[PDB]
Write a protein that binds this ligand. Sequence first.
Ligand code: SAM
Ligand code: SAM
Ligand code: SAM
Ligand code: SAM
Ligand code: SAM
Ligand code: SAM
Lengths: 291, 291, 291, 291, 291, 291
Amino acid sequence: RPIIAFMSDLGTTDDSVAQCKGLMYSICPDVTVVDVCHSMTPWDVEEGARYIVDLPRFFPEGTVFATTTYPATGTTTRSVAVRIKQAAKGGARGQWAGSGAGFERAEGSYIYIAPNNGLLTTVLEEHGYLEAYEVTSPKVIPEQPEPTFYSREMVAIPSAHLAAGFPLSEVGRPLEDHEIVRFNRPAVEQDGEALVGVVSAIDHPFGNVWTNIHRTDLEKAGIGYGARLRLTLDGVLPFEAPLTPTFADAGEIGNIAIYLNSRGYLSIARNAASLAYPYHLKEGMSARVEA
Amino acid sequence: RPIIAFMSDLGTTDDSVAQCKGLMYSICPDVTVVDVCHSMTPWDVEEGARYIVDLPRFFPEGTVFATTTYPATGTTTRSVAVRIKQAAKGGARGQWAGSGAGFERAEGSYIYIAPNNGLLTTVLEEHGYLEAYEVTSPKVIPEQPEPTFYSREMVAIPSAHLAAGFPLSEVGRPLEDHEIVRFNRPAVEQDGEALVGVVSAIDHPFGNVWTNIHRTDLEKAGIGYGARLRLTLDGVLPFEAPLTPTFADAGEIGNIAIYLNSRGYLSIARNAASLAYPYHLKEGMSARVEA
Amino acid sequence: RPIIAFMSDLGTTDDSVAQCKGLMYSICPDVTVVDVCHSMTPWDVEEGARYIVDLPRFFPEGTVFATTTYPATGTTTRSVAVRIKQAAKGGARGQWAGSGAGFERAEGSYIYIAPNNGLLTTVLEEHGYLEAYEVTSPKVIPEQPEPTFYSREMVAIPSAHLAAGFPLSEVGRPLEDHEIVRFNRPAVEQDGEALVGVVSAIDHPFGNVWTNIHRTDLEKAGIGYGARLRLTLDGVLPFEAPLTPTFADAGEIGNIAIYLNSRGYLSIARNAASLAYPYHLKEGMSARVEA
Amino acid sequence: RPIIAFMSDLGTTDDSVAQCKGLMYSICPDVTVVDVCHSMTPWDVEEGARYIVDLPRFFPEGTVFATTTYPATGTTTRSVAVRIKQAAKGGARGQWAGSGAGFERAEGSYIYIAPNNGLLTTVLEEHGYLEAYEVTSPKVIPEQPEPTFYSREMVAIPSAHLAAGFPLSEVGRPLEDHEIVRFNRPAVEQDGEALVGVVSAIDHPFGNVWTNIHRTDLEKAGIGYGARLRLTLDGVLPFEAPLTPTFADAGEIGNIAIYLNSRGYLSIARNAASLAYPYHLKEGMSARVEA
Amino acid sequence: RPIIAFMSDLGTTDDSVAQCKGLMYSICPDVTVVDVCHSMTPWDVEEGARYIVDLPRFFPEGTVFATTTYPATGTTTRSVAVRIKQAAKGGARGQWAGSGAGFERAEGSYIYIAPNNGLLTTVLEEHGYLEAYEVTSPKVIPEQPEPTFYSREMVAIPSAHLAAGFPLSEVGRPLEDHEIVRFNRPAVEQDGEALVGVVSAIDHPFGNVWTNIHRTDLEKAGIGYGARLRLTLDGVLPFEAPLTPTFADAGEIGNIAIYLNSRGYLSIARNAASLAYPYHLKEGMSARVEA
Amino acid sequence: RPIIAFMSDLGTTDDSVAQCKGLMYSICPDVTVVDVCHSMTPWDVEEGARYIVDLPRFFPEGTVFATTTYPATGTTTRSVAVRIKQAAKGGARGQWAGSGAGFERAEGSYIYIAPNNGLLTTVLEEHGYLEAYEVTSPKVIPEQPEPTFYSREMVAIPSAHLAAGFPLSEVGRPLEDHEIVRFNRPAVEQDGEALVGVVSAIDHPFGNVWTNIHRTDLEKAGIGYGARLRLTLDGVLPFEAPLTPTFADAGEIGNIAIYLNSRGYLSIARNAASLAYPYHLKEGMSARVEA
Ligand SMILES: C[S@@+](CC[C@H](N)C(=O)[O-])C[C@H]1O[C@@H](n2cnc3c(N)ncnc32)[C@H](O)[C@@H]1O
Ligand SMILES: C[S@@+](CC[C@H](N)C(=O)[O-])C[C@H]1O[C@@H](n2cnc3c(N)ncnc32)[C@H](O)[C@@H]1O
Ligand SMILES: C[S@@+](CC[C@H](N)C(=O)[O-])C[C@H]1O[C@@H](n2cnc3c(N)ncnc32)[C@H](O)[C@@H]1O
Ligand SMILES: C[S@@+](CC[C@H](N)C(=O)[O-])C[C@H]1O[C@@H](n2cnc3c(N)ncnc32)[C@H](O)[C@@H]1O
Ligand SMILES: C[S@@+](CC[C@H](N)C(=O)[O-])C[C@H]1O[C@@H](n2cnc3c(N)ncnc32)[C@H](O)[C@@H]1O
Ligand SMILES: C[S@@+](CC[C@H](N)C(=O)[O-])C[C@H]1O[C@@H](n2cnc3c(N)ncnc32)[C@H](O)[C@@H]1O
């Protein structure tokens, strides 16, 4: 019962995703295609990365992740197919997902296929990888690929061959590590006893504010739940709350909560109200946290 | 072939829904997950209720409805799982759905799982229930549930266990009726021989206007198809038309139709034009009908 | 493994599409329902037609295409169900889709079911058809159809019966060709050797600009992939570039590309940037191209 | 433009071949079907082998060879489909076919599909193969195959699916070499400094006599063009002549030529007269050559 | 991609068939001409019938069958063109042809054109017809037809006009049923519990013996696979075998097999040896079958 | 849509013709290859000539006629390629072929390519020619031709290049008329006013008898369609009948018809019965006709 989990920049307003799906069922008749999202900002490989890096622990072993924003579509660039190493625990704690004690996932159990444009930068950093190949064989891509639709030609199509059991190492030649394109991720800076980062995302549809300050950064300023914090956004908004597990800990509806989001990152919100929307807070604003 | 029908407030802009689906396929490998919608206004339990109350008659017997907006995520609250009694006829006329005379559905054939925050208020009113349980067993929820994602931890995951055949009565202790939270439904008032309600929803993407005035409220006033109505909105924007089965009965395109929608409620529209959008008509506006 | 590909104007904000899906699973339990889109402008049959005309070559043989915008819902009109002839090659070049040399599809392999309102106009022009029938049998539609929901009653429900093996010729009487409603496609006209048409679509989410000028319009205008073009939009905005296969051929991020999109038509974009959104370009604006 | 080249034992006296072709055009609408021959002695796998071993170098790359005599039709046996390795030079000299220096053919460019009964023995010996699969998938053969017509059910039909782009590896499980049936090729023996073979074929319609003594058997005896040979047949009818390139080198019409045929093998004829017919010479007769 | 499937009595030894083909390509440049056979006994309309009655299910809808033996060539007789009703299932079981569950063929989807000499007797009996016309219009036949070649003038030529889309009903006037010439087919006689018929054909090139006793005649003496039968040929040869699906069921090579042939008729053969040839068995000999 | 019409002495019993076809498709991928016949008596150039002389008026303009019996294969001889002048009317009367008044063909529209051995003798006599060239260029034949297969090397291969647009004048040097080998046609001679010729062919499969006496030989012998004739064959067998247009004019099945065949020549047959086969009549027997 193979699964392809599909994340693209193709949108939800025309038949582009359906074209790709049609081809997935043609190649792998017993497949289940799970939509991740198709709503990302086109060409923002850093946003795309965010929607896919946390996926593996939630899916059955053998799942293929077909992930693509493809601004170099039509050129002589070719996709990269990689078998990751660690499925990786996640969340505010760092645990397996599922009921009971969670579903432990074996190593070497998921494949990602993507343009070689840095989309997989965070996947490779947080999971590692065992093997990586250029996608070139005409067994798994078109001999005459549509120039403006490499997300279909070079990702959707070969993803389905992989789901159907095409050997990974036969899609094309092995890639050396330096041949895999990466974007740089800005580090969280130690700064006195303060940690200095950015708003990484506005968490839609709620308007929560997510930062790039990870639980591990907090876990060696020595900051746990209960700590009284000052989280300054945009240089000029010094929010103050204790770090709490969840929104309702702030008390009355509308009160500020500082918490660790489900991806493991320091976040700020209001309790059952929107923080970001009324005040137009945005990705890219500064975020400093301290006692 | 189990089905879970999934309605949430998680949105369509990141991987949130997909994480849920991954676990659903993990737990119940044979399952089909049907998206109801994920676009509801967060925390608006009355809106969520409208998207789920009409579902049972459409679905195969044995379908599990996983329905969630979870503003109390991370607190000691626990989800409720209920087996409904009557699948219930619906529509403007009150009938079974499907081809021929429709598909009559047996009693006791659908389970809802939701936060215990009133989301199921109208489901329980219109369908009844046979049994209800608190969802607490670590066989069906996580031992260490993610504080900010109870929509996954306490709804998606246990829904998949129920679809996989986990006995409903084993999810946790039985609930007494007074322990299941309800919201108050605004009452249609009689004011002279006029009926006074509210705009319950704008029917996107068309811009039709739905009220909370039911066909039963109309048949108790002796108002049937053919009747000349004055229907007044927001307390100034008035309208006049006979009650007709459908939009085309208003004649020329753009003309006003007053009709019964597919959920059984008095509604107003323009024939193949939008009523609500040009005039910025809105849910919450007063709606008064006089004959 | 029956598939129904489903394109509607029902939106993504309530349970409308899920009601249809529920019944599709009720009638055809082993079906896969693939969403095309549900976001088209309500009642815009020409837009709807664009989202379905290119589908067949991407899908497995036997796929049913359930395609609906139904402004005449609740009237005496009845749907049309047709088995197309040619699956038809497509793309900027004209090819079968898939890996290798692509996947050929046998003739007569796909059925469309649609309101008889012209929605299938371009499907029948591009693919031809082998048989057509009015959809009237109570074996495949309700005896008492819901007046405002013919997209469910007269499209979704009968599509599921067809997917399940119900004989196409038993749905109702055969329709003559003149009884199948058609829309008039706006023709690409002449002044000098400059082609004058329209913007047929903004290609979301990228903001690329699609015209109704086909590859064939360009050949024997003597415009080939080398040609330096002046393209005026809305009778005001002029652009200049050679015709190229893809976006990156423009050079730097932001540069103008005039190209043939993946559906076979002359289009214009910026390279990994949005052309339409910053200039507020729209469907239905005039488009003029000259060497 | 896919080609299937079709060799069978179905004859030319009824509609058998045509039924096969009808299905081939049905499945692969763009296909060209080329008849090799349908006149072979039924069930004679060694004869069929001779009509197909020399074909690849003549055909465009990507050609599918559908080759069948099927005495085990209706049993549990299943056809084999193999992609050959080397297209292989041929003729009296050993060269590529075609104008100029010939058309060199890339490796891995031809598929044979046949009963697994030894028919492909010489194809595999002379060309090698890259992969071989059992043909079992109901995507490419009938669910209820006609018991007496496996030449259509298990060869013609799947050949058309391969020409239409169905992935070879999806026809069924891979075969190990020992699972592909072979016949034993009769060995050319050395008897003194004479070579002892057999008449392998009468070359109709001319009545030339072909032996199984190869040019490589001759060059290993230091026998080249110009050599005076005694070639003895059926163990009594002897002949004497030099080895020459062609028939006209025997001088007057009716004179004996000893030559290398276009398949690379020692042969004997009369110059523009028949050798075999007047004397009723036959395949299976002994053939001994002394220099 | 129109197809003409061509069956004649013109032979394979001169340019007669090529003349007709040349004219087919002249009239319908995109046509594919599929040879059925050209080897029938001249003027034996009953043999001709046998080569064409089984064709439709194997070919794409819209195929034109050009079928002719024309002993009345040069007279004032004119051909008949008919659109058949049922494509009809066939074979030992009675099923659609092709991979999977077969290709279902729509009604009214094939045209036959023939001399009105009884050639179409079995086509009309087993398929039925919707409309029939005399072929007279000089749009589709020569004004001055070659007297000795009506197979070209009155069949080949108009067949190509029909393939190219000439309206069937415009070739000439409608024919009443009684105006269509039929030969009589001898019935299978019930006779005790024995069924009494004839050898209808020797199945070349194998020498299998085909009778006119159909699966339906067996299917109400109550005779299925496994029944121990006595099949007496020529009054004096009481063969005995169980009815089996195929030849190899008889066991050792040479053993007698009684089976249902691919056309649906009771047949007798030897397993991978010829029955008819060594003993000179012939069409027209008696055939009786019983328990 | 290039066509090659292919007449050889290669037979229908091995892969010889398919080797030629493979290369024709290799060189001219969009070609249609039409078989004329491959069954002529090997090396009988006069028989070969009969099968090709009447072809041009039946085929689309631009058709290449590849026509070969090559007993001088492997010698220094080279083929001749000629563009004929007149397409030429034919038949018992002398007309253009096709529906209506027939299809006129422009002058200079067809090329024949043949061994320079007299095979084209009657083609050049009946049609004339505009240009002729020796076929020597390595652009169109092999540099190292297979000695025993010049029908492939020097006819099939160059025919495909000509079909593809290769300029006829670039195949080799122009040939003067005297360098084109001719055979001597046996002349219809005189004793009294009785015409004395030969049986030119047995018209298989019917067993009709063709003489070398043309319609023109008969006119100004004063023999018209009323004339009562005595025709003696082989100097022994006498027959009597009037000259009629067709076989059925003889009356009862079996009666004698003397007529003009579809190629323009005096012939004799039985009405829907074989004249030649029962009496063992053959090509080359004497034929004598008198009023
Ligand atoms: C935040 S979401 C999980 C999806 C989120 N995008 C993530 O990745 O973690 C889970 C539940 O949290 C509740 N929630 C989200 N933001 C909230 C807030 N600010 N206050 C109260 N509850 C909130 C929502 O009702 C939703 O059902
Ligand atoms: C009303 S929608 C059904 C979904 C709707 N949200 C409901 O729950 O009843 C079904 C068909 O109604 C047609 N429709 C909706 N609003 C209309 C209007 N104002 N005029 C004409 N047709 C309308 C649409 O084209 C749609 O395909
Ligand atoms: C154009 S989309 C195909 C869907 C599109 N609606 C169509 O029908 O062709 C495929 C890839 O093209 C890339 N793309 C789209 N527009 C682009 C542009 N203007 N510049 C560079 N890349 C673009 C996107 O990143 C996407 O993954
Ligand atoms: C009998 S044929 C099908 C054509 C036949 N004329 C018909 O219409 O059914 C299919 C395969 O059957 C095999 N076959 C035919 N006669 C056979 C026999 N007597 N024993 C074993 N196999 C036989 C042949 O090898 C041929 O490839
Ligand atoms: C030998 S055939 C090629 C086909 C043959 N079956 C083969 O596979 O090599 C090619 C030309 O050879 C010529 N040929 C064949 N046998 C000949 C013979 N014994 N003497 C002279 N010419 C011959 C024929 O006229 C024919 O056109
Ligand atoms: C004579 S054939 C044309 C081919 C022939 N080889 C020629 O070149 O004219 C056309 C039709 O004539 C009919 N025919 C041929 N010989 C006949 C005969 N002796 N009596 C009656 N009909 C005949 C056949 O049934 C055939 O369909």
